[PDB]
Design a protein around this nucleic acid. Structure first.
Ligand SMILES: [Mg+2]
Ligand SMILES: [Mg+2]
Ligand SMILES: [Mg+2]
Ligand SMILES: [Mg+2]
Ligand SMILES: [Mg+2]
Ligand SMILES: [Mg+2]
Ligand SMILES: [Mg+2]
Ligand SMILES: [Mg+2]
Ligand SMILES: [Mg+2]
Ligand SMILES: [Mg+2]
Ligand SMILES: [Mg+2]
Ligand SMILES: [Mg+2]
Ligand SMILES: [Mg+2]
Ligand SMILES: [Mg+2]
Ligand SMILES: [Mg+2]
Lengths: 60, 184, 134, 144
RNA sequence: GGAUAGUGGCCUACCAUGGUUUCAACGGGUAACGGGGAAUAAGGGUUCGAUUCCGGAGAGGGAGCCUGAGAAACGGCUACCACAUCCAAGGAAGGCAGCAGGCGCGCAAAUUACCCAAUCCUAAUUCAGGGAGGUAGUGACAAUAAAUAACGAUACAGGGCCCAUUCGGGUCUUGUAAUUGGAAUGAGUACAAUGUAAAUACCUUAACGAGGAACAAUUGGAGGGCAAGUCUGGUGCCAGCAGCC
């Protein structure tokens, strides 16, 4: 094998990724209220039951 | 130097982390009983295992064995006092398969919701932790109390707390404070 | 206050130290911080002896307030009270005053330094003074 | 008779027989020989500190074509030389030269991790500033 | 027979040639103080036990000895070895594996704090002393409980039942809001008392202390094992990721 190579192109894509920042969004509840929130969307909600009760299917 | 302090763990995680048949069941128990973690269910199942372990070790022993009867009576009585076990099932064979949520429903979380005055389990969890509860004559703010069938009629609002008189309320007090000064 | 209702429980006579031992059970609804300094007189006219023959300690408030439990001692006369009660508890009541004393670090220094000297040291004190001149 | 003796007074044969065949296990071999003490450049420990000597262009095993950007490190406590991988996208820039780094294994329990040949250690800290925090630009590398 | 407080090759003189060993002697290694115990275990087991209790050893390495009932003592002494301090160079003084603290070594471990009030010990002794011990400081080593939100009214989306009067109200539900409201209180300040040897905190409690831009929960992962994207932009066997595939 070989121990030499192109070390001058380390971090090629990370330094090349366009900088998109986090959008501001309302805070989620922490602790018990999150379990209250998650229980609502899964069991008492039928929003995504398309064929198999998907959780995050892609937009289609 | 001094004697060591004895401490013990009170819960155990399941062997398989991601299994859907149990993952959704866990969210069911935490769903309508207002629990913030799986460790509440994990905690309950730990001494549920310990209760079954003690009960299984009793049935192995011969009938009329003094050790079988003594801790058999103690175990059967101590759960009956808590109320997780009905009076009819006092045979030491129905304690093996009691339920997983029988212990949980005896908590002060549920009792405040059962006996009115909370109108939702999520409101109750606040009510206990907000220090407006008197299970006896004493204020308690621990949602897991395991009421003992001798104090169910004794849950009432603490005398030194709103909704029980003897004070109007903290935020209500400053609420009228603007009302008095604005009228002048 | 309001309904102080000081109560004494588990009262046992202790003539070995000429004292009465009891648990000071305090019920103070709508009140806190029962101010044990005031527990002395209310326990005094109950036993009718005097205010300076009674000592109170403990009194950990229960969860939520409105009730306290502690320990109380009442003596027949102040003479044996001064001879039996610890010095630290007496100064709280004002019976005695703090004894002025250097810190525990400083006392250790003086003892160690005085070990280096044999005898009174007056003979050495003049000898070093005589030597320091020349 | 299934092989092994069944006599009630043959516990000596069974215990000694078990001793001789226990050596065919690998964990029992390393534990009692103390190889990790005598070999395995650490001292049986999970982490070690060393000085970076140079950067390496190790190429990927089959089927894979890539450069892995590892570093040669000489350990402090024993002076042994090892090769360690610098895991993240572009983290070879923070480990430039002569820095005093902390290394950890790869979780393979003493063997190479992936298609990286002959490398069984990774960089976890450079200049004692927690390399992971550098990639997420949370902390700053010391100037000296 | 000597010696010991005593038995004894413990030592001495003489005598005999014995004693241990494949049922593992003797020798070698131990990242070996031994136990009470710890982790995980259907049952059988495996691994660990420097370390809060019991026994043993040691005071830098050996040796020797005074005093004393008790030491081969080391915060007792003498010598050598290795370190090592102060000197107006003639000499003198040392053992922190005690408590803090420092330097080194490392992947790796805290204050040069307060007090004898509690536990108990020592002394001529109720009183003095005790870095033994206790208190406080640092401390995400491990453990226990448990906040980070709760509830109304208006606008949407559902199933029975009153009418059986086009599809009209829907009295009742369970959720969806860049809609609005009252309440509830804790972290955090704090008079005060409580607490304590004196304090700091805990438990109480005047008073001050929620409406989001707030008082804002992280750590990881989303092809499979192993639930959780066939979304968007970039990269183009490069960068990279990937315990295994
Ligand atoms: Mg046999
Ligand atoms: Mg003899
Ligand atoms: Mg002989
Ligand atoms: Mg050793
Ligand atoms: Mg010991
Ligand atoms: Mg010794
Ligand atoms: Mg040393
Ligand atoms: Mg010695
Ligand atoms: Mg010393
Ligand atoms: Mg030290
Ligand atoms: Mg994350
Ligand atoms: Mg995946
Ligand atoms: Mg992703
Ligand atoms: Mg899946
Ligand atoms: Mg990623």
């Amino acid at each position: 094998a070989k121990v030499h190579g192109s070390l001058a192109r380390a971090g090629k894509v990370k330094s090349q990724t366009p900088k998109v920042e986090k959008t501001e969004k309302p805070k989620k509840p922490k602790g018990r209220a999150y379990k209250r929130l998650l229980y609502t969307r899964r069991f008492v909600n039928v929003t995504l039951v398309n064929g198999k009760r998907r959780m995050n299917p892609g937009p289609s | 130097p001094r004697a060591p302090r004895t401490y013990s763990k009170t819960y155990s995680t399941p062997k398989r982390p991601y299994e859907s048949s149990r993952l959704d069941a866990e969210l069911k128990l935490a769903g309508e009983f207002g629990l913030k973690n799986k460790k509440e269910i994990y905690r309950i199942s730990f001494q549920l295992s310990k209760i079954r372990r003690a009960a299984r070790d009793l049935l192995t022993r011969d009938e009329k064995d003094p050790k079988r009867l003594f801790e058999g009576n103690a175990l059967i009585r101590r759960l009956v006092r808590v109320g997780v076990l009905s009076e009819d099932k006092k045979k030491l064979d129905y304690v093996l398969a009691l339920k997983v949520e029988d212990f949980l429903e005896r908590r002060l979380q549920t009792q405040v919701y059962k006996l009115g005055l909370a109108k939702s389990v999520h409101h109750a969890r606040v009510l206990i932790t907000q220090r407006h509860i008197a299970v006896g004559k004493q204020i308690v703010n621990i949602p897991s109390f395991m009421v003992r069938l001798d104090s169910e009629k004794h849950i009432d609002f603490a005398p030194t707390s709103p909704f029980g008189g003897a004070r109007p309320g903290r935020v209500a007090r400053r609420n009228a404070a603007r009302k008095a000064e604005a009228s002048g | 206050s309001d309904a102080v209702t000081i109560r004494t429980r588990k009262v046992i006579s202790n003539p070995l130290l000429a004292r009465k031992q009891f648990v000071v059970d305090v019920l103070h609804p709508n009140r806190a911080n029962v101010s044990k300094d005031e527990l002395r007189e209310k326990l005094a006219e109950v036993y009718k002896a005097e205010k300076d023959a009674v000592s109170v300690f403990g009194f950990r408030t229960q969860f939520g307030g409105g009730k306290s439990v502690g320990f109380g001692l009442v003596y027949n006369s102040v003479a044996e009270a001064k001879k039996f009660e610890p010095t630290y508890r007496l100064v709280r009541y004002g019976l005695a005053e703090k004894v002025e004393k250097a810190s525990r670090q400083q006392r250790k220094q003086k003892k160690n330094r005085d070990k280096k000297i044999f005898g009174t040291g007056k003979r050495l004190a003049k000898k070093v003074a005589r030597r320091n001149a020349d | 008779g299934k092989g092994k003796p069944r006599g009630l007074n043959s516990a000596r044969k069974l215990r000694v027989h078990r001793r001789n065949n226990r050596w065919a296990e690998n964990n029992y071999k390393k534990r009692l020989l103390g190889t990790a003490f005598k070999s395995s450049p650490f001292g049986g420990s999970s982490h070690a500190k060393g000085i970076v000597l140079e950067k390496l262009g190790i190429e990927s095993k089959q089927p894979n074509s890539a450069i892995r950007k590892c570093v040669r490190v000489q350990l402090i406590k024993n002076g042994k030389k090892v090769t360690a991988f610098v895991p993240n996208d572009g983290c070879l820039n923070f480990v430039d030269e002569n820095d005093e780094v902390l290394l950890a294994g790869f979780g393979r329990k003493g063997k190479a991790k992936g298609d990286i040949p002959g490398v069984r250690f990774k960089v976890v800290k450079v200049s004692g500033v927690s390399l992971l925090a550098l990639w997420k630009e949370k902390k700053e590398k010391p100037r000296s």
